Design a protein around this ligand. Structure first.
Ligand code: MG
Ligand code: MG
Length: 71
RNA sequence: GAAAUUGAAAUGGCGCAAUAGAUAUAGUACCGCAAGGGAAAGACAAGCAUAAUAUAGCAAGGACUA
């Protein structure tokens, strides 16, 4: 849904792209132990087990607790 | 590798500071049958602990919110 148009001199391309709204008809009304724990978490979040095991103090201390923040 | 020949006057350290300077705290201890050999030392390194560990690998780098 974009309108392309060179200008008369042909030196600049003009693109008209209005934002199209979602039609009302295209919408639905609003409705009104360590082992087993890690298996449950992996099933819940569609991950593997390895993510949920802890890490040693060395890794934990290596993690930066005051990371730079942008925007 | 010569000699002939020639004819110099007169308390200190750009030395060390205990692995250095004597081997030297001592020619002792100790070693050797013996001759001999011959030391060491006195005034937050490594290793650990606080705090073991998490898939993958020269152990880092690029990074990354992490
Ligand atoms: Mg000495
Ligand atoms: Mg140390």
């Amino acid at each position: 849904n974009v309108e392309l148009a060179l200008t008369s001199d042909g030196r600049t391309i003009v693109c008209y792209h209005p934002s199209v709204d979602i039609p009302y008809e295209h919408t639905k009304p609003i409705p009104r132990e360590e082992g087993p724990m890690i298996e449950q978490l992996s099933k819940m979040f569609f991950t593997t087990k390895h993510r949920w095991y802890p890490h040693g103090r060395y890794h934990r201390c290596r993690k930066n607790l005051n990371p730079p923040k942008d925007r």
